[PDB]
């Protein structure tokens with residue numbers, strides 16, 4: 011099989027080459043990112059169009075690598091939309107990504123699948139398109155194609171594909187997901203389907219936060235259960251509270267407001283009493299980081315406002331709202347509030 | 355001051371002394387915990403009653419120390435309830451803490467304040483007593499006096515006292531909070547008033563998780579802003595999604611189910627691509643912890659089921675339901691669902 015593929019966004023080569031210095035710290039050669047995905051798809055035998063309105067995003071020498079792979083470059087998103095069975099958004103954060111999705115949705119061929127990469131959760135992308143998806147384009151699927159690294163670097167060995175959500179919702183058909191998986195595999199990459207509501211947390215840049223937070227949770231779980239012999243329910247409740255409270259404070263007050271609310275000084279004193287083993291290098295690392303915060307950050311923390319934040323049991327609250335106003339209205343509330351934070 | 359003080363629970367001296375070996379691992383001398391708080395309050399000149407139904411919870415020699423400090427020991431919670439203006443729950447996790455609170459609430463004097471320590475959040479404690487607090491005992495306040503260390507150890511130098519919530523709820527009066535603060539200070543401890551909805555996250559056992567997750571958030575924030583120059587709102591959105599998704603997964607599926615959903619292997623690969631700096635010892639510690647997981651933990655993770663979990667924007671959803679069903683009904687929903695997770 012070979013497919014018609016559309017990739018949207020060449021990727022910021024100045025970022026990859028000069029900011030991240032990928033060629034020398036990670037490996038490979040430019041171009042990286044979206045234009046590299048297109049190259050790899052074309053070398054896999056696919057019929058590839060790359061949509062990039064900004065010709066200045068890379069030198070002619072790098073554009074040439076793209077053209078030699080057999081990628082057809084267009085400046086018009088709509089032309090790319092009519093071309094592909096599968097559409098890969100390597101698009102700039104924010105309005106650009108949502109704008110491009112909304113631009114192409116009424117032009118993509120029957121049964122097309124639209125996949126986000128780094129820039130947005132597929133559930134959020136789905137929500138932003140839901141009024142069209144539920145009416146005029148019930149054929150179109152939403153998935154994702156998250157690289158494990160920057161495409162073009164040696165470290166990129168797989169894709170995470172957003173599949174059926176943990177609560178059983180299908181954003182794309184099984185056939186559309188299998189086409190996404192086969193597009194990944196055809197490039198010599200591993201391809202893993204992950205529930206779409208979880209996928210961006212394990213593959214986006216914030217996976218940094220996921221890994222470090224998870225390491226603290228497992229540290230506390232181990233120490234709690236094996237040293238302290240704390241009840242498992244107690245440990246889990248405190249974990250939920252910590253993560254939920256931090257999430258909510260960032261949502262209302264930003265990073266600096268959340269730090270102001272938790273108070274690192276206090277936190278360091280308190281967490282110090284949880285040093286039961288020297289095997290806890292995560293706690294060791296955290297304590298030194300919190301004691302040496304960048305100086306401009308601390309100034310902005312003092313200036314920050316802690317906004318009204320409500321303590322909740324989030325999944326329990328979802329169930330409660332369903333019992334009060336019904337499944338349909340509850341889902342409407344969940345969708346509107348998700349779009350307000352993650353889309354605008 | 356000659357404040358009337360009631361403390362509930364002597365503390366598990368077998369755990370502190372014989373299991374954890376605090377005298378040699380931390381310092382100080384037994385007794386520790388609730389009975390030590392009682393001793394310190396009594397030595398500060400307060401009129402202290404300690405309620406402990408189980409005389410076998412410490413040796414006779416340790417009881418003599420409590421008694422020589424002038425602490426009056428009673429086995430009946432109701433008698434201690436009638437005594438104190440301030441009531442300190444050093445009570446076993448779960449039904450015990452809630453049971454003792456419900457036992458004393460209808461017997462405590464006019465204007466008394468009831469304070470949790472390690473075992474429960476003051477907001478949850480308030481929710482569990484709310485049916486009585488709203489009607490018969492609108493005079494009674496709820497606060498906390500969390501030692502953020504084990505009382506009796508050198509590390510215990512302060513108390514975290516839960517004050518007005520970030521969203522403006524006063525669970526105790528200014529006069530009741532001032533008593534908790536003076537009780538702390540008269541005992542030589544510093545006293546930090548912190549919004550009650552945040553207090554346990556900064557002082558509980560789970561402060562280990564708070565400190566480690568926060569260091570990961572600040573790591574990502576620094577790398578995001580200063581290396582990648584990612585939009586601040588993108589970074590904050592990803593932090594929120596990560597922390598929320600983890601909280602929600604633990605809530606529906608337990609720690610092992612959450613681990614199964616996030617998939618350590620994928621996470622490790624992805625987070626490795628975010629290793630941009632030698633400054634990131636939090637990320638370093640995390641990668642070694644996750645890649646060297648206990649084999650019985652890894653077995654229990656694969657056996658775990660991932661339960662239906664709903665992607666939400668929690669604070670946005672709270673605002674959404676307040677407008678949808680009104681402030682009073684939304685607060686009822688938040689109260690009932692919080693109790694369902696954290697009390698029942």
Ligand SMILES: C[C@@H]1Nc2nc(N)[nH]c(=O)c2N2CN(c3ccc(C[C@H](O)[C@H](O)[C@H](O)CO[C@H]4O[C@H](COP(=O)(O)O[C@@H](CCC(=O)O)C(=O)O)[C@@H](O)[C@H]4O)cc3)[C@H](C)[C@@H]12
Pocket residue numbers: 022025030101102103104105106128129157158159160213214215216217582583584585623624625627628
């Ligand atoms: C090294 C990392 N490792 C990973 N590791 C893992 N595991 N997963 C990953 O995804 C990554 N990475 C993905 N990476 C990654 C992903 C996103 C961005 C974000 C970009 O650096 C950009 O900051 C955003 O995409 C937004 O930039 C975008 O901003 C403009 C849109 O504004 P606009 O012009 O539409 O708005 C107007 C409004 C003006 C008004 O208010 O009127 C304007 O400002 O003019 C776009 O043109 C582009 O510049 C950076 C790096 C890293 C390369 C990479």
Ligand SMILES: C[C@@H]1Nc2nc(N)[nH]c(=O)c2N2CN(c3ccc(C[C@H](O)[C@H](O)[C@H](O)CO[C@H]4O[C@H](COP(=O)(O)O[C@@H](CCC(=O)O)C(=O)O)[C@@H](O)[C@H]4O)cc3)[C@H](C)[C@@H]12
Pocket residue numbers: 238239240241279280281282283284366369445446447448449450472501502503504557558559561
């Ligand atoms: C070293 C740590 N550093 C800190 N550092 C910081 N920053 N913050 C902290 O809070 C702490 N710590 C607080 N710590 C801490 C706090 C709670 C627990 C957990 C408690 O130990 C739990 O409350 C017990 O595990 C409950 O279970 C204990 O009680 C059971 C009896 O059955 P039951 O509870 O069902 O019986 C009822 C009787 C009902 C009746 O009386 O009718 C009851 O609850 O009494 C016992 O078998 C034992 O497992 C452990 C350690 C650590 C010592 C300490």
